[PDB]
Amino acid sequence: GSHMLFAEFAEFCERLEKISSTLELTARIAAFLQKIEDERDLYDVVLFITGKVYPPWDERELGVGIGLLYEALENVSGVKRSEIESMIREYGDLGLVAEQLIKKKKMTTLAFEELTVRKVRETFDEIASLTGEGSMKRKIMLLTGLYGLATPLEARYLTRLILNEMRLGVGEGIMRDAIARAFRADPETVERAYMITNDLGRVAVVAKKEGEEGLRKMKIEIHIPVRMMLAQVAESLESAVREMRTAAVEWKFDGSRVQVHWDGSRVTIYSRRLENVTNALPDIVEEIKKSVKPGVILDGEVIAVKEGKPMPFQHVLRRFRRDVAKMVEKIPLEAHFFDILYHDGECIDLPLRERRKLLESAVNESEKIKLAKQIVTDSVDEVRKMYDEAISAGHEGVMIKLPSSPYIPGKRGKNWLKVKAIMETLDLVVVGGEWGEGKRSHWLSSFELACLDPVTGKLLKVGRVATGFTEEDLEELTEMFRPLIVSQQGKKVEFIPKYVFEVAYQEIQKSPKYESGYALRFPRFVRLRDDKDVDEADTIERVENLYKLQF
């Protein structure tokens, strides 16, 4: 009929695997997108090609782990899970295994196959809604029903989609460019629209229906997260405060960045990576309802405090993880706001100094809700005094901002600069590992680390880490990595990209040993970052900038 079969999409994706050119990928994808008339097949295709079923800020998650996939594949193929697991290490991809099992199964028991993107979407939406007793088994039954109806190539990309790695060499950059190409829009205005909606599918549909003009007309709306404006690391305090002659200066807090939307009938709170953390923060939510003027979207920092003294940011992260009533008691919080993006209408096109005024009249300071102290100055001595004060208070340094700059969602330019005493850590994808030896043989001991190329979504190796781990760390990480082993050559294993580590280092060197062109000198494990998906790992561009900044 008229509805797109997932198989049409699947065959399209298969052909993209052969193509390594970024421009060629862009042009192929644009051509495909142009010929979709049904706007929800368009929406789904744009999401699906990026390995996404839902936007991260959407409260819906599939909640399907590789173990559920194994059981479903068991059900449909008859082959036992132990054999399917050896097949993943043989083929290096569960998608290729699923393809092989279904190829064998329809050869044995022929039926007509293919399902619509619409059915895939509906089945996914049901799976996402399932909680409680028996929910895991029904999820397996729903997946089993889907694999029973799918072609081998459909089963491949269904599997890769659920695992969020399509392996097509297509990232966010190619998709922005392909949507721009398809629908006669400037790639910069597709980009801009993405930064305020955080749904590329929605953006594609607007580009289809209304072109460039419809994309420019898109506005910030409350409860839809906007990509935060980001700051560059400054070389030094006096170099930053001379590029800008006069500068707005604030503390840089040891905490977690959030964005608060309200309203004023309900509050939503988004984290730095735009996870909806509202239900984790009833304490902050209530304080916002009494202390802030309704109809705003605020940029802020949440910090953990205890008996009047500051606590480190990973304490806020624990709150974000989550009976949440117990957590409010263990880990008290306060919020410090430093910007405003919405005040009965967009206000990001102002003037920092003008936004500041808007911010001041919007919050009524209490014990749990504060404004960032801001000074405006051309004096290096004044900013060093704030810097000193910030550090003595248990925080990191200062933010230095251009008082005339507008707020630019998702952008990391020189209009904001962070100057802190400590160096940066990186968050990097765990792409591989090594088994320990002798007694430690039952644990992974060493981990391969990769940064992200945001245009292609490819992971570029950047180093290897073995220090900074407790033995319970190794116990825990081995258990969570084991199912993801997709290659084992002796001690060397490769993983399905999934987990992100926070990693410290002494130096980034240029090196030919990795695809990235960079190597970490003395990498050291800080912690596992559950708050971070693989597409929130630090980018090759970040690594490059951090390298250049050493000299």
Return the SS3 of 302: strand
Query: Which residue spans of the chain are classified as CATH 1.10.3260.10?
Result: 1-224
Question: Rg for the chain (alpha carbons), in Å?
Answer: 24
Asked if 394 contacts 422 with a C-beta cutoff of 8 angstroms, the reply is: no
441 CB-contact burial (10 Å; exposed 0-12 / middle 13-18 / buried 19+)? exposed
Query: How far is 348 from 272, CA to CA, in rounded Å?
Result: 18
Distances (CA, A) of 179 to 187, 189, 281, 375: 8, 11, 37, 43
Asked if 249 contacts 237 with a C-beta cutoff of 8 angstroms, the reply is: no
Q: Which helix (H) or strand (E) holds 415?
A: strand 412-420
Q: Could you give the angle at which helices 22-34 and 39-49 cross, rounded to 10 degrees?
A: 160
Go through 205-231 and write b for each residue having 16 or more CB atoms within 10 A of its CB, e for each that does not. bbbbeeeeebbeebebebebbbbbbbb
Q: Which CATH number fits domain 420-551: 1.10.3720.10, 2.60.120.10, 2.40.50.140, 2.40.170.20?
A: 2.40.50.140
User: Cβ atoms within 10 A of the Cβ of 46, count?
Assistant: 24
Q: Could you give the angle at which helices 39-49 and 6-16 cross, rounded to 10 degrees?
A: 40
Asked if 487 contacts 493 with a C-beta cutoff of 8 angstroms, the reply is: yes
Query: How far is 90 from 92, CA to CA, in rounded Å?
Result: 6
Q: Tell me which residue of 371, 398, 378, 376 sits closest to 387, measured CA to CA.
A: 398
Place of tokens 């190329």: 453
At 244, list the tokens: 């800008």
Query: Which residue spans of the chain are classified as CATH 2.40.50.140?
Result: 420-551
At 31, list the tokens: 């051509």
At 407, list the tokens: 């707020």
Long-range contacts of 180-183 (CB under 8 A, 24+ apart): 180/207, 181/26, 181/27, 181/30, 182/29, 182/30, 182/31, 182/33, 182/34, 182/207, 182/208, 183/33, 183/34, 183/207, 183/208, 183/211
Query: How far is 136 from 54, CA to CA, in rounded Å?
Result: 19
Q: Given CA atoms 455, 457, 460, 466 in this order, what sign does their dihedral have? A: positive
At 80, list the tokens: 């036992």
Q: Tell me which residue of 399, 382, 363, 384 sits closest to 255, measured CA to CA.
A: 399
Asked if 336 contacts 301 with a C-beta cutoff of 8 angstroms, the reply is: yes
At 90, list the tokens: 């043989």
Q: Exactly one of 208, 252, 420, 461 is catalytic; name it.
A: 252
Asked if 232 contacts 414 with a C-beta cutoff of 8 angstroms, the reply is: yes
Query: How far is 485 from 466, CA to CA, in rounded Å?
Result: 18
The torsion region of residue 394 among left (phi > 0), alpha (psi -120 to 50) and beta comes to left
Pairing of strands 230-233, 412-420: parallel
Give the CATH number of domain 1-224: 1.10.3260.10
Asked if 39 contacts 209 with a C-beta cutoff of 8 angstroms, the reply is: yes
Query: How far is 396 from 363, CA to CA, in rounded Å?
Result: 24
Binding-site residue positions: 250, 257, 272, 301, 338, 412, 418
Query: How far is 521 from 464, CA to CA, in rounded Å?
Result: 9
Overall residue count recorded for the chain in this entry: 551
Place of tokens 């984290």: 271
Query: How far is 461 from 457, CA to CA, in rounded Å?
Result: 13
Whether residue 252 lies in the annotated active site: yes
Query: How far is 268 from 270, CA to CA, in rounded Å?
Result: 7
What DSSP character marks residue 229?
P
β-bridge mates for residue 393, sequence order: none
DSSP string, 490-532: TTEEEE-S--EEEEE-SEEEE-SSSTTSEEEES-EEEEE-TT-
Query: How far is 84 from 64, CA to CA, in rounded Å?
Result: 17
DSSP string, 2-33: -SPBHHHHHHHHHHHTT---HHHHHHHHHHHH
- Residue 422 φ/ψ, nearest 5 degrees: -80, 160
Dihedral angle, C-alpha 145, 151, 157, 162, nearest 10 °: 0
Binding-site residue positions for ATP: 250, 257, 272, 301, 338, 412, 418
Asked if 542 contacts 483 with a C-beta cutoff of 8 angstroms, the reply is: no
Place of tokens 């405006």: 376
What DSSP character marks residue 407?
P
Instruction: Name, in order, each residue with C-beta under 8 angstroms of 490's C-beta and a sequence gap of 6 or more.
Output: none
Asked if 501 contacts 526 with a C-beta cutoff of 8 angstroms, the reply is: yes
User: Cβ atoms within 10 A of the Cβ of 522, count?
Assistant: 11
Instruction: Give resolution in angstroms.
Output: 2.3
Query: Which residue spans of the chain are classified as CATH 3.30.470.30?
Result: 225-419
Residue type at 127 in one-letter notation? I
Query: How far is 481 from 495, CA to CA, in rounded Å?
Result: 7
Q: Tell me which residue of 56, 48, 8, 38 sits closest to 175, measured CA to CA.
A: 48
Domain 225-419 belongs in CATH node 3.40.50.1390 = no
At 83, list the tokens: 């054999």
Asked if 187 contacts 177 with a C-beta cutoff of 8 angstroms, the reply is: yes
Q: Tell me which residue of 246, 370, 321 sits closest to 528, measured CA to CA.
A: 321
Query: How far is 45 from 42, CA to CA, in rounded Å?
Result: 5
Dihedral angle, C-alpha 495, 496, 497, 502, nearest 10 °: -40
Return the SS3 of 187: helix
At 232, list the tokens: 């560059």
